[model samples]
Target: SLSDLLYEIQDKVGLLTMNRISKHNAFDNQLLTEMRIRLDSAINDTNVRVIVLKANGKHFSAGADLTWMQSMANFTEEENLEDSLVLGNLMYSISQSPKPTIAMVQGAAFGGGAGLAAACDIAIASTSARFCFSEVKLGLIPAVISPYVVRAIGERAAKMLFMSAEVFDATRAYSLNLVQHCVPDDTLLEFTLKYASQISNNAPEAVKNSKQLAQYVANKKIDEELVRYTASLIAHKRVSDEGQEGLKAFLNKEIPNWN
Candidate 1:
């Protein structure tokens, strides 16, 4: 199919790669649409246990595309707002994928590209990779990408990063916790595969449930209501069939049923 994004399964991983090289993997409206569709394909595919976002060229993505700015260049208030609305939906879906998602950042990941790094569950950056908030440079706010970036780096750092729009190295991105791992450039994909391998060897449902629980508990106050939610969540899990299989198999010295 003639698509701007490619989706394929390997090692129980769904790899969604941007196919635009000449454009530096920048996402236009059409390309963004394809990305949403391809991502949904990964979400629904039974073979894919994890999802990885990457790009075909040296750069991860230049963020937005050329025509995107020119055509939608303050043409109408509705047009600008609608474009962000579209981008927001795609951002939200990726941020909350049911299956685990990882981003492999090799080169420059600017603006929304850096947001992509922040949106996924795990983000890995190569030593050569560079990142930038980038929105301020063009006189546009980060807009749809803010929530994901804020979630990764927090509100205080986000205030600084958003204002500066200065280019930063992968190590700084790591320092800010935008990416979980920082490895050599050549080993980016290999290390990502290593993570995928370790995650895939466990019980799938248990892993998914664990991620959901973490999402629920992150940054929340410790109170009776929160304690009750956590108690009920664990109560259901301990009695769950997969949970029983895992516990029993561990005690019996056998592999879990996910095998």
Candidate 2:
């Protein structure tokens, strides 16, 4: 079931790499299923403080495999829906991971591959990399990846890109907020590793809670209910064991237990 990918763990970081070079690391049914399983495993692994998603070969990903797409074109509506749901779920799992996740993108990331980058907590791409929401070109909409893409780049940009199916470079992606950093091709891995190390060195529970807090607060009205909710969350964290340890470590000028 697991082809077109490689998995490794080092220094508290879980590395999941797309290895389907012959297909430009494109997603097929098996690849999607493998990604879901790998993500789930990484999240549940205590030793893995962060997840780094990267790919081998020249391109990061070209979205869907052409042969697989051809096969899907003949499927019934029900079958198509089922397949789409699986892809949607895979993206959802990555987006909703409790642990921090980073996308280390190189080369081109089109269609669902772009969506994959958008879904991560942080995306850092090489300056030479290109991206596009190309589903429109195929006479189909980027239905499943829409939510994540919109959240990453905002509605206006999403509407423009999705409709136009225009290919943009990494700098454009960064400006759109789809990617956090655009670095030289040579330093992409170094930058990602440094960032991951920074995250891994912090208190894991605190990091996880902070991620939860960000999502919980997003788009919520700044009313009494929201204020109370946030207050409760922080109050709980401030007294928790990890929180206490972090505070003590800071006062003592020592590394925290997590580090």
Candidate 3:
């Protein structure tokens, strides 16, 4: 499966939903395309300071649509690579997105859904959400979502989660650091909205650039040259439009709404 739903809300928050509720909003071609479009839109929109990833229906997602697996059995090698490339890009988009992202987990999050949640900067979930990798059961590997998942929970944990394919609850997800918060199902909306409002209250340019910086420094081998380059980033942004806006907003004691 790919991505199923796409929406942008007043440049404030962008939403992407995996729509196949009957199948737990599994990924399909259309869903993937929608996800790419929505994620790119959120990343580029100056007004969209945050992105909220969710899915329709009871479960957050049940992972890839089983139909895609059936179709792959007939795919040529070239076709398979071409198809799989979209997922690579999808993961990259979320991982590298300048805007902050939050995955709102409501129900089951299996396979790729687990990957999607892992890719976000933060995940907030209903206490009832179920989590799984579930690839090993089908003799497939989690090729695309591996980097993010492994990094989020580390190699030891990833080894267990990816291999076992067991369905764990939201509390386990929070225990594994896959989610930042787990709240009662009734309160999930209020809790997530509060975080969204907090995100909206930050200086947009600063928040975006700071996220960029986190990407820049997160895994790089920091030599003197890298250090110099990193320092230059601070100088450059501090003198640029965002920097000035941040300073002005701070001095005025108001949030910098760059848009």
Candidate 4:
């Protein structure tokens, strides 16, 4: 299947799995479209407190499918531009999602797969995990994931790493501050669940607001006016219906359920 990754909800966790392990879970057009829709659905679903992204195969994602790239060579210039934008928007959506997101990685995460993991709030990888921005080797630029990837590893590191396209292990990735934590291969899931649980225990609104605040401050100057505007927006949200329910629960000394 072109779209090998599948999305679903179990308990309070929303899981998105990359299904094309045989193909190194490489991304194709169909997978890109499905990811866009799946992420939107999961973020909108109130029952899903947090999202965990994982893959079923040997590699997290091997970047773009070689076959798919071959096919793109025949596309008109206009078609190529539009298609690339669609893929970029899909990545951006996941990057800007309000809910907490975690990436559980193992094996290989070359190219776009590496980008996906970096976009997440926290990335937990197995010691066996390997990463490379292989697009440069293919004479391709990592156009879409540049923003998130640059932010995660800084300009100097990204410049060298992207150019070299060398595969590095989880320990090296952690040193570069790309992967957050590296665990034994067998306990990757258990390791990720602990982090996910911590996120779930926090207030939903607080999590969402904190994510937005982090994004804003990272990209722009957090000046007095910017802070005031954000504060007002947050205050208005706190007085909303769901916000009222949360406050009522606080007064009642219990967790709030925004029915």
Best by lDDT: 2
For model 3, state the Cα shift of residue 191 in Å.
2.2
lDDT of 1 by residue, 1-259 (tens): 7756887888888899887888888866788778888899899888888989888788998767888878888579987777777778888999778899899998989877888888899899999999988888888788788888998899998889999998899989899899889999888888988898688777899889888889988889999999999899889988999989989999999988787
TM-score of 1: 0.94
Q: After superposition, how far is residue 249 of candidate 1 from its true place, in Å?
A: 2.0
Q: What are the lDDT figures for the candidates, one per model?
A: 0.86, 0.91, 0.82, 0.83
Task: Provide TM-scores for the models.
Answer: 0.94, 0.95, 0.85, 0.84
- TM-score, cand. 4: 0.84
Candidate 3 stretches with Cα past 4 Å from truth are 1-4, 219-259
- What range of 10 consecutive residues in model 2 has the weakest lDDT sum? 1-10
Worst 10 residues of 3 by lDDT: 1-10
Sort by lDDT, top down from the best = 2, 1, 4, 3
As for candidate 4, its clashing pairs are none
Using TM-score, rank the candidates from best to worst. Answer: 2, 1, 3, 4
True-vs-predicted CA distance for residue 68, candidate 1, Å: 2.5
Clash count list over all predictions:
0, 0, 10, 0
